[PDB]
Amino acid sequence: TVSVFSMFRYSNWLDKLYMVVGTLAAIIHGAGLPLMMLVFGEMTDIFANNLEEDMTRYAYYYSGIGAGVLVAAYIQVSFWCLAAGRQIHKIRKQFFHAIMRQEIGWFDVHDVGELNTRLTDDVSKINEGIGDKIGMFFQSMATFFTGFIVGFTRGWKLTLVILAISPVLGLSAAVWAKILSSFTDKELLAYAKAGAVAEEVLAAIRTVIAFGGQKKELERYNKNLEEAKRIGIKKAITANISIGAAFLLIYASYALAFWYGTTLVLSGEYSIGQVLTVFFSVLIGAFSVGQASPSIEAFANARGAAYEIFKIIDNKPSIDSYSKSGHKPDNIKGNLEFRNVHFSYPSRKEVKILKGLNLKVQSGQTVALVGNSGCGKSTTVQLMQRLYDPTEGMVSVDGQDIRTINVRFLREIIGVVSQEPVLFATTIAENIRYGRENVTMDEIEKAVKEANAYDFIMKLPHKFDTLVGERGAQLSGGQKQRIAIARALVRNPKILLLDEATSALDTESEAVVQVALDKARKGRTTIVIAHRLSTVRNADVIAGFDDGVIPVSFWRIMKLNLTEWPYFVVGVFCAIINGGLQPAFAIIFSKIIGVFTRIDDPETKRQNSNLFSLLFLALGIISFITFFLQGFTFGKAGEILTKRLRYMVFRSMLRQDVSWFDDPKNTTGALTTRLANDAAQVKGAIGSRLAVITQNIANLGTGIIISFIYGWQLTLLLLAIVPIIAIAGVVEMKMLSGQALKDKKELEGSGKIATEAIENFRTVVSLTQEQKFEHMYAQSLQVPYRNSLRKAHIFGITFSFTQAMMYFSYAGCFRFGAYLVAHKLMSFEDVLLVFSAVVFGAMAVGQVSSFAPDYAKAKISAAHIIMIIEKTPLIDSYSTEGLMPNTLEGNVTFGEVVFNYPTRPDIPVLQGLSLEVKKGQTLALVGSSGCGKSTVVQLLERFYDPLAGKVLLDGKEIKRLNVQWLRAHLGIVSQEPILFDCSIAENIAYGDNSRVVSQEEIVRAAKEANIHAFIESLPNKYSTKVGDKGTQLSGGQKQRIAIARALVRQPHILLLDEATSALDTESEKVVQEALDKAREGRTCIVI
């Protein structure tokens, strides 16, 4: 994604030398096995015909090659794994440095879970990418050319004979298909559109559920998925037909070459040993290409992850603390001011929070600005600390603007006591000493004495010993606030900004906290923000602030993808014949070898000439047909399965309750990933496991049977030796997984420190304690750094020993085989046949098992998919039962209603009020006890379920009525509307999905919403799109569109959720009068 020479950005001279020596050793190692074939052939030629002198000369040659490759095998892996270990340590340490530098305005746009997951996984992905794989790649190439070179030095004809008949071509086509699959994609765009629709619906799940438009969204998703299925089928057809056409062209060219010259073109005189060289070397070189595909896949994934890693690293923030270039004034008596400053959030530019606020505080003063819990409370607190730069105007301290002061020095003289006193999982002494790192115990003691908290600490055991406040005994709000006050006192600031110190903690402990605040407030400027106006009277200046105004894996997966049984039958038959064809190639070669290696026989006989071309054409046609049929059928079956599964899982997700979405385990990102990743790349693996198993069985069993027919002793010897190399590969993968799984345990302290810093990032930047967290992460990396550098020796030794065993296996086979052919028994053609069957079927199945994605994540993904279906039908949106009365009096009564949020049931939200509504009467909950305004909209719409209490609609309990009918007779308007990416006409007709409404109803609703003129003034009357790529609209236009959408339904009860959110105080009159005009003769409840 970025480049090919940019992933190696962090590499000094030593790492460059490591990589160069590693790749040179790999090149030497790769060109060793084909060269051994050459000397083996020389030795056999000499033997077939002083004997000890020739035998011992090549024996030292044979031992000399073996010794060098044994050393080269160690150097190839040892030096590459050291270079990757040194770069990843620098990348991992540098990436976390960049994260701690980005300001607050960037974190809210991104996701903390996404950032932690990326830091945990894509760095490991890069490590796997630039690790030992690259070296392996060169080895394969170092073999490949070498083998062919040998095959083309000792007679080019024979290679051309072996290149066609032998099993080379099918495996080559399989690996070309693997690479093309790894490089094309082209599904991504289609499912990108479909998943854009999916995430648009999922993010707006509240309004979709409240409006009952599940079927319409399901149909839109179905249409997009059908388009994706069509394009995927076309792509699979094109790819498979192209590869098959290449196969057919190769074999037809062979057949034509055999014409126009009756076999004299491809025949010559060859020795008994030369054929062994030009056969085994060519076969090994052609088979080596199968080992270079995982390397290419790994490198591509490494580039993909490194793109995002380097984008985050390279970005330069507008304001950064890691820049010691700024004014550092002394004697800051404190003269903060606001020179009529307008501020708007960078994310929501249209919404304005600070509408030109002016403030002026002298030294040794205090302010008591009073805010509202809904919003407009902590914006000035954030703006003062240079978290967000002002849009218009400026903020100055002591007559000096803060834009010319280094932010690191600026943030170290400001108190930041906030609503929730977040603490870290460490000792209380460390928590108090986080600010002002050069602090002795005496200062901490003095602060806790002037914090009204040491008495409580001493009454409890463990005097500042551990008292962890994250996983241990969770302290009460009062003592946590006292701890935060102590930390602020240790910081020793000059501008104290106590914010929401009386937000949610109980009134029982108000005395101690308030006394501590009053004691600590003396001697410094104070901009206290409070909601209750009964204890901030001690401040010099009091003003009001408001809107700028002052499981287990399961089988039975085959039940899914069952209706498409003819595709499976045809694919299985084609897999059987394709797998069985490859061993038959050995028989064909053993039968026709005698015709391509003799010129003494007159060309008049020419054998037959024509039937050889017929055989080549027949083999080409059969291979083409079988490969095309297998690929097309299995691809089509997999795509149909994934489309149907996506449809069903999306329907199941839509059906279930909103509380399932409210669970923090599954957010919109998790569900999008489930619909995207774990429904298409996994179930295809289970569907094609039948194909791969059938192909492997047909490849191996047929070869074993034909070898047994053509031999007994050598066949049994090879059937005994192949399990040895299989066990060697098992040991290799076991050693790889021994550290691939121990790495997670090793990298656990670093991960927890990183996630603690990232999750609480606002407190970290406020305290300017990023350097300490960076150092802790540095140590938690340093220990696993030594562990990873020690892993290199073990990995190198294991790889070297496995390679030595694989190298010694070939020598033993030739020693025994020559022991059989010399004493008659088996002809050399039979030896070639049995080798090509047994060992080159074992290698072939070993390579094919690497493809066809693993049956490990597919099972857990299938379990997740199955568990998502029929998961929580407790409150089904389209329940069939229930009564639907015709009359609707519109009376809502509440009695002793007690409800708790399922995510946090310990904290109550409903006190058990008694609220009764008559027809044609309006009321608001702002004047109630508070904190219970944004909940009644869930209760009346049956989003949740009251644990204790009762709700009556027109004197009837709402639990018995059908949910769909209840949702179809309620109008809801929120503070802001979310508009789907479609035309305005559909966004207006969305109000009533029971039946299709024509243009007349939409026009009348727009007229009643005072929005018709604006819509008609647009270049497109009703076909204009909205959202991201559409025509952007202001707050008033969106509010009017929402009012029109609500009024299309013609409901009987209206639910307003802070509609008058003070959107610039310019278009409020028109929307207010439209709402008042639409509120006549209808029950309403304003929040």
Residue numbers in the entry: 33 to 81, 106 to 606, 694 to 1230
Original authors' sentences:
The ATP-binding cassette (ABC) transporter ABCB1, also known as Multidrug resistance protein (MDR)1 or P-glycoprotein (p-gp) is a ubiquitously expressed drug exporter that plays a key role in cellular drug handling. ABCB1 is a type II ABC exporter/type IV ABC transporter with each transmembrane domain (TMD) comprising 6 transmembrane helices (TMs) and followed by a cytosolic nucleotide-binding domain (NBD). It is topologically arranged as a pseudo-symmetric domain-swapped dimer with the 4th and 5th TMs of each TMD making extensive contacts with the opposing TMDs and NBDs as first revealed by the structure of its bacterial homolog Sav1866. Here we present cryo-EM structures of lipid-embedded human ABCB1 in conformationally distinct apo-, substrate-bound, inhibitor-bound, and nucleotide-trapped states at 3.4–3.9 Å resolution, in the absence of stabilizing antibodies or mutations.
The predominant conformation of apo-ABCB1 observed here features an asymmetric TMD arrangement with a closed central TMD pathway, closely spaced NBDs, and widely spaced extracellular “wings”. We chose to classify this state as an IFCLOSED state based on TMD conformation. The structure is marked by multiple secondary structure (SS) breaks in the TMDs mediated by Glycine and Proline residues and several predicted SS breakers, most noticeably at G317 and G329 that leads to an elongation of extracellular loop (ECL)3 and wide separation between TM5 and TM6. Closing of the central TMD pathway is facilitated by TM4, which adopts a kinked conformation with secondary structure breaks at P223 and K242, effectively dividing it into three sub-helices (TM4a-c). In conjunction with TM6 and TM12, it forms a central 3TM bundle that closes off the central cavity. In contrast to TM4, TM10 adopts a straight conformation, contributing further to structural asymmetry and leading to a lateral opening to the lower bilayer leaflet. These features lead to an overall conformation that diverges widely from canonical IF open conformations as demonstrated by a comparison to the alphafold-predicted structure of ABCB1. The IFCLOSED state that is dominant from our analysis is incompatible with substrate binding, with TM4 involved in 3TM bundle formation to close the TMD pathway and also sterically occluding the substrate-binding site. As such, TM4 may play an autoinhibitory role and act as an affinity filter akin to the regulatory domains of ABCC-type transporters. First, the IFCLOSED apo state lays the foundation for the development of a new class of ABCB1 inhibitors that could potentially trap it, thereby preventing substrate access to the TMD.
